[PDB]
Design a protein around this ligand. Structure first.
Ligand SMILES: Cc1cc2nc3c(=O)[nH]c(=O)nc-3n(C[C@H](O)[C@H](O)[C@H](O)COP(=O)(O)O)c2cc1C
Ligand SMILES: Cc1cc2nc3c(=O)[nH]c(=O)nc-3n(C[C@H](O)[C@H](O)[C@H](O)COP(=O)(O)O)c2cc1C
Ligand SMILES: N[C@@H](Cc1ccc(O)c(I)c1)C(=O)O
Ligand SMILES: N[C@@H](Cc1ccc(O)c(I)c1)C(=O)O
Lengths: 215, 215
């Protein structure tokens, strides 16, 4: 069965102004690594997560699981395991030169200070109630896109985030007790920014370095 | 060097209402496969693309190239190559059962009818002017997220899109003449929806199937 499309449509002038304003708005977004521990209603995070879940996906499999962690003990254990992996990584060269402008150590207090950690898992396949497996398609792409929606929703809500690698992969899977068809994809602490929060003075690429037009 | 974070912040009640409204808004987004060929100013697409490019990325490499195609001859050649690949795929089983509710053939008139095709490329590495290579990190994740921003921006602008696999991979790379460090990631036709546009009557997963909360 099919149904008519019910999306809002605008005339060219509204479209120009809307697209210009959204660009300016999203250009203000920056990765923030120093959080306030100020509380946020679960309902806001739920809205944000289900917004991420409206993303398109290969064959409409929605091959993702969002684990929302506010439990300070689990956050503590996650931070501990994460800080341990990085300690080994930060001493054992191309990489280290690329990382210089961000001023990051193996320290990760944001993993406990942020009121919520959103841990994104990808699903390689679904397990029917039969025990049988049914594979999903273009999972990497689908979950990446959903993560894009997640971050867009976080910004829309006036919050900040830090997109973080899912290390330690094994530990995240264990402590959050996710099944075999799932693997950690991203780790995203969410919260208000610290009052005096600073970010690296970075510049994004210009149109010419990012965009190629075939008229 | 560092600079203060300059993002908009709201009080809990605005945050709740903003997050609820954005969820409803994004829930109206649907993949559309029947387009209007109504023209759109390049400036809107530029705004949309540079909005995608504000996404976070591993080590701030922004490992992506956005190829915007409006040239009807290139679109014609792309559609031809794409339709040929799919013809072979649609006859040569798990997949075909999963694809039934979308009612798609190997036909792809949208690849010419859509006023713009946005072809997203990922960059495995950068090539310095020395000829030397400098690898990028978590490219799949970064470009996926940027694609999420792209689609969020398209919806914000009142347009629709079809997230499409980058097939034929080799052909897209050839006709768009992209260098060796680049590979096709996604194909995204963009435009107004056809007046009587229909979409599959799908239902997205509920909170419980998508979300796990550790209180
Ligand atoms: C896939 C991915 C992984 C990332 N991993 C880390 C990380 O492990 N540690 C960190 O401090 N930042 C991480 N980041 C944040 C980037 O460093 C940041 O997005 C980049 O420096 C650009 O800053 P901006 O997002 O404010 O534009 C990651 C970003 C992405 C997209
Ligand atoms: C990575 C990816 C690849 C996709 N490839 C195709 C495709 O090749 N053909 C197609 O008709 N739709 C494709 N889609 C669209 C999905 O089928 C669509 O998002 C899904 O059916 C859910 O519909 P919705 O986006 O309206 O919620 C793709 C989506 C994603 C995320
Ligand atoms: N690319 C093919 C088949 C297809 C269709 C839908 C979809 O979500 C996925 I992943 C693949 C096509 O366009 O028909
Ligand atoms: N995960 C490490 C190192 C790091 C840092 C930034 C970055 O963009 C990437 I990819 C990796 C850390 O958190 O320090």
């Amino acid at each position: 069965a099919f149904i008519p499309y019910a999306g809002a449509q605008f005339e060219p002038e509204e479209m120009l102004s809307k697209s210009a304003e959204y660009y300016q708005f999203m250009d203000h977004r920056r990765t923030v690594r120093e959080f306030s521990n100020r509380a946020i209603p679960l309902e806001v995070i739920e809205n944000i997560v289900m917004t991420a879940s409206t993303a398109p996906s290969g064959a409409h499999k929605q091959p993702w699981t969002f684990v929302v962690v506010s439990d300070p003990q689990i956050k503590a254990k996650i931070r501990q395991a994460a800080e341990k992996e990085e300690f080994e990584s930060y001493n054992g060269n191309e990489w280290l030169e690329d990382l210089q402008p961000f001023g990051t150590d193996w320290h990760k207090p944001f993993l406990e200070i942020a009121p919520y950690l959103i841990v994104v898992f990808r699903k390689a396949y679904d397990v029917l109630p039969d025990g049988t497996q049914r594979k999903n398609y273009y999972v990497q792409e689908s979950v990446g896109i959903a993560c894009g929606f997640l971050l867009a929703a976080i910004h829309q809500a006036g919050l900040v985030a830090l997109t973080h690698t899912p290390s330690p992969m094994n530990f995240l899977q264990k402590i959050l007790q996710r099944p075999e068809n799932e693997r950690p994809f991203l780790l995203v602490p969410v919260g208000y920014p610290a009052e005096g929060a600073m970010v690296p003075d970075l510049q994004r690429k210009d149109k010419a370095a990012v965009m190629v037009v075939y008229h």
